[PDB]
Every structure is written in structure tokens, then in C-alpha cells.
Design a protein around this ligand. Sequence first.
Ligand SMILES: O/N=C/c1cc(-c2ccc(O)c(F)c2)ccc1O
Lengths: 236, 235, 9, 9
Amino acid sequence: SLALSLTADQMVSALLDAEPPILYSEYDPTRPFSEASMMGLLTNLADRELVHMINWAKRVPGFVDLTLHDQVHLLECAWLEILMIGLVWRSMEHPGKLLFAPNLLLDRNQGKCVEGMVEIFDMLLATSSRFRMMNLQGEEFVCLKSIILLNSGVYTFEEKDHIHRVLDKITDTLIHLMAKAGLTLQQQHQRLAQLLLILSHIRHMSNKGMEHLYSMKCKNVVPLSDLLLEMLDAHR
Amino acid sequence: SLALSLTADQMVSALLDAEPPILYSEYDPTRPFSEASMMGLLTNLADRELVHMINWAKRVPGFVDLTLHDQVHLLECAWLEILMIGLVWRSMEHPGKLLFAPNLLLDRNQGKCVEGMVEIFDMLLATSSRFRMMNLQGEEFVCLKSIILLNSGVYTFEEKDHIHRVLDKITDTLIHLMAKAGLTLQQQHQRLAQLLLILSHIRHMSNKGMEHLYSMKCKNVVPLSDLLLEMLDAH
Amino acid sequence: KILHRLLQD
Amino acid sequence: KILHRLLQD
Ligand SMILES: O/N=C/c1cc(-c2ccc(O)c(F)c2)ccc1O
């Protein structure tokens, strides 16, 4: 594979270069929210973000070296995790608010417009405060997001040996960035540990957000795009 | 506190000293398993393990320094994670099998006795194969299990500053163990990363198993202990 | 809670 | 197989 020959700085450049753009919502600020209006906006935004995510995944070093179904399995298992860590990253400079889209900035009170949404909101806001407290760097963020893609579904399958090698390469890249920033050896593995334990929580928010979507689908509050239903059926 | 003063080897000795016992099931291998019976066995075992886990948690360095409800909160979010990583640890030397108890060794096909259980079994088996592939050490296991207790519920909360300081110390302990084993610094960072990524999957198994229990609780196939219902309604 | 009771003693 | 199609293009 070509991803193993990459250097740490070259790994960083490829990840930053593949970053998906920040999309806008269909929001109209003369429409105070109902429940179906907010859920429709959130699902419409997620649908358009998934399209950019798929083309982002193919630009993650080592991801194309996987078979087609293995690429499908990883994205099916990690898509909501990847959306959420991107949302948390966007909201870093907005304490107490979730930046879904530049024209869609919601706080904790807006979440009550949907049954059970405020519980997910507070978890998302807690992750944003943690990134802000740790002063997470963009180079670290794109490494964490790549780790989610390769790790979330790897134990749910030679292809794993390749994935574990690429994962080790991202770890070397994370340590490489922390060494550049002047962190000592003890600070490096401590910060490395602090970053990776976030993934346990992002995984937890994804499972909770996955069941919330399945209920809103079953209760039929808002219809869903076929692609979003396929990603959602993959978790049931 | 006293947990910050602990050295690396003293940290490992304390965690190894607090290890809970391996409990035996009420299982009779003359009887065949009804779906309600195997569920009653597993939940009865999990209920007795919870009593020992609560006493194990109090000996985890830094855990007693927390207020009562903070201890309640951390245990309520991580209890099934801690049960599952222990089960996975006991099953390392039994490939393709789950050692719930020394007299309760189950494989894939017997998980089909319960609806949706074989999906959980395969994840637990896959986690056990990963530990065996990495050849997880008992000193590393007790560190990971203490990390689960302190980390899984910290963001669902000065109390956090103390927990994060204890977590940093366990990270130093993990690195100290790998350096003693002759690993290079690159090998230490990678192994530390590999071990911590396991916890993401353990959270996923706990979430799925949490919803499987809540399902069997509503279907009333078999009732569970009141302690188990208290933890179950925390989720 | 039972958990609070067992944690107390 | 919508996810398959977007991964090909
Ligand atoms: O508990 N559920 C939370 C939830 C979150 C999203 C969502 C949409 C777009 C994002 O970028 C993003 F990060 C998240 C869509 C639907 C949902 O139900």
C-alpha cells in the first residue's frame, strides 16, 4: 500500500486536504421551529453531509486499499460518529451552542423541540467543552476522525492487519504533532490517551443518536432519504 | 489525595490486589437450556458480580475520594462495560468460547438460545481474540478496567480535575509497564493507542447489551434482581 | 438506591 | 445499494 510509505507531515497534509466543506442548512429564520421542521432540517443536512463524507473516506490514506464491502462496513458503522465529531469540532468556538450549519446555530433550549434530543445535545456540548478545554488542534481532529472510520467497524468484520498498520501510522502521526508543539514525552502519551478516550464517548453518543433516529423513523415524524435509511437499517 | 502519591509499581500492586474473585454459576450441565434459563443464569451471575464490582470500585485508587453520587454515576454508566471486559479477559485462553464462569463455558451456537444474543456473543468473542492477538497482560487489564470506571461517565457529570489527574496517572502506569517489557517508545505509543481503541468497542458492546437486557426485561422472559433493574433504568 | 447503599457500606 | 454506488464514482 501507498499509505504506509507516507511520512507524518505527508499524512497530515493528505488529511487536511481531504477535509469536507462546511455545508449550509435549508433554514429560514422566519420559521420558528416545530418538531418536524427541525428534524427535517437535521436529516436533510445529514443526507448532504454523507455525500461529502463518502468522497472524504476515499481520500483517507489506506481506505481505498480495502475491498468495496469493507469500505461499506466501516462507513455504515462510523457515519454518525464522523458526523458528530465534525459537529463538535465546528462548535468549538461557540461555547454552549451546536454549530450544525453556519446559518443553524442551536443551543440546549432548542433541542427540546424534539423528544429526547436535549439528552444528545448536552452530550455533544460536553464533548465540545472537552475539545475546547484540551485546545484540540485541527491536525489532531483530522487524525481522530480518520481513526473513527478505520476503528469503529474493524472488529465487526489481512484486511484487518492493513487497517491496524494504518491505525499505527495515525498514532505515529498524532505523537509526531505533539512532539512538534513542544510537548514532553509524558505529555505526549497523556494527551494521546486523553484524545483516544473521547472516542468511547463519541461512540456512545452515536449509539444513542442511532436509536433516536430509528424511533423518529418508526414514529414517522419526518420521512428520510433512501441513503439515510440504508445507513440507519445497517445498525438494526 | 493518596492516589496521586502512588508510584507506578505500587499502582499496579494495588489494582492487582483489588481484583474481584471468579464466581461460579448455579449451572447444572444435566439440564438443557431454555431461553429463560440461560438468561436467568447470565443475569444471576451478573448480579453476583455487581456486588463484588462495587467493592472492587472502592479500592480503585482515587475512586473513594469522589463524592457518593459521583461514585454512583460512574458505576451506573460503566457497570456492563466492566463486566464485559472481565468476561473477555477470562476467555482469552478459550478461543471461540466465552468463560462466563469456570463451569459455564459457552460458544456461538448456544448464544442463539436467546434472541439477538449471538450478535453480542460474536462481538465479545472478537474482543477476546484481539486481546489474545495482542497478548494482553494482567497488569494492562487492571489498568484498562480502572480507566473504564473513571472515564465512561466523566462527561455525563474540580471533581473532573481529580479524575483526569488519576486517569493521567494510569496512563503513566501503562507506559511504565510497556517500557519495562522492553518496548521502544514508538511501540509504547502504538500499544497504548491499540489498547485504548478497544474501549470504544467495549462501549459499543455495553450499549447493545444494555438494550438487549431492557428488551428481555419488558418481554418478561425472566425477571432480574432489583439491583440489576436499578442499573438498567439508569440507562 | 441499592447502589448508594452498597457504596455506603 | 446506494452506498455502493457513491463509493464507485
Ligand atoms: O440524537 N440524534 C441526534 C441527531 C444528529 C444529527 C446530525 C446531523 C448532522 C450532523 O452534522 C450531525 F453531527 C448530527 C441528525 C439526526 C439526529 O437525530
